[PDB]
């Protein structure tokens, strides 16, 4: 029986384009260079396929942002410049699938990408396929909930339920939190 992680703090759920612009400039003008973010993206599961419909930034375990781009009808300016803001980087698993994604969705670029697999491979010395979960687990000593209830939800719904809120917060804030593990390790 290993503890459940979970976001303890601030879920900030924005779903028009102006306000996310508007905080993501408020997160770019708190950062610097060298910053992190915990990063993960949700989007929903015949012939079209799925874009994204959700960006989490964890900033901090007090704040996270949930940006719901499925209900905005235009990408966030703000939320593009942060993200190909090389001076800030996005620390997250499976995150160049996500880079390509972006791209092909919004042709938004996302610069400074960390993925925690490979820290992890190269810090703990292995060579492993991981999963953000079994990253957890060894790394946090954590479990993360993972049913496909809420994984594999419709995440282009309005709006995120409190329990789909608190899965994509829980998931970029892993990020930050393993982030910070391996980067710190003694």
Same mark, same amino acid.
């Given at each position: 029986?290993?503890?459940? !992680?979970?976001?303890?703090?601030?879920?900030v759920? @924005?779903?028009?384009? &102006?306000? #996310?612009?508007?905080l993501?400039?408020?997160?770019?003008?708190? !950062?610097?260079?060298?910053?992190?973010?915990?990063?993960?993206?949700?989007?929903?599961?015949? $012939? %079209?396929? @799925?874009?994204?419909?959700?960006?989490?930034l #964890?900033?901090? =375990?007090?704040?996270c942002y949930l940006f *719901?781009?499925?209900?905005? /009808?235009?990408?966030?300016?703000?939320?593009?410049?942060? !993200?190909?803001?090389? &001076?800030?980087?996005?620390? $997250?698993?499976?995150?160049?699938?996500?880079?390509? %994604?972006?791209?092909?969705?919004?042709?938004?670029?996302? =610069?400074?990408?960390?993925?925690?697999?490979?820290?992890?491979?190269?810090? !703990?010395? #292995?060579?492993?396929?991981? &999963?953000?979960?079994?990253?957890?687990? *060894?790394?946090?000593?954590?479990?993360?909930?993972?049913?496909?209830?809420?994984? #594999? /939800?419709?995440?282009?719904?309005?709006?995120?339920? =409190?329990?789909?809120?608190?899965?994509?917060?829980?998931?970029?804030?892993?990020?930050?939190?393993?982030?910070?593990?391996?980067?710190?390790?003694?």
């Open positions: 029986n290993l503890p459940f !992680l979970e976001f303890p703090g601030s879920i759920y @924005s779903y028009e384009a &102006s306000d #996310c612009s508007f993501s400039e408020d997160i770019s003008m708190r !950062l610097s260079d060298g910053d992190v973010v915990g990063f993960d993206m949700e989007w929903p599961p015949p $012939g %079209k396929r @799925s874009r994204v419909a959700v960006i989490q #964890c900033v901090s =375990e007090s704040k *719901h781009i499925s209900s905005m /009808s235009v990408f966030p300016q703000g939320l593009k410049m942060l !993200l190909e803001n090389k &001076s800030i980087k996005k620390a $997250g698993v499976g995150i160049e699938g996500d880079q390509w %994604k972006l791209l092909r969705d919004f042709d938004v670029k996302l =610069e400074s990408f960390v993925e925690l697999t490979d820290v992890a491979n190269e810090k !703990l010395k #292995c060579a492993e396929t991981w &999963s953000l979960n079994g990253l957890v687990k *060894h790394v946090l000593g954590k479990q993360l909930l993972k049913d496909k209830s809420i994984r #594999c /939800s419709n995440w282009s719904n309005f709006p995120l339920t =409190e329990d789909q809120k608190l899965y994509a917060a829980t998931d970029a804030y892993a990020g930050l939190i393993i982030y910070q593990k391996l980067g710190n390790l003694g």
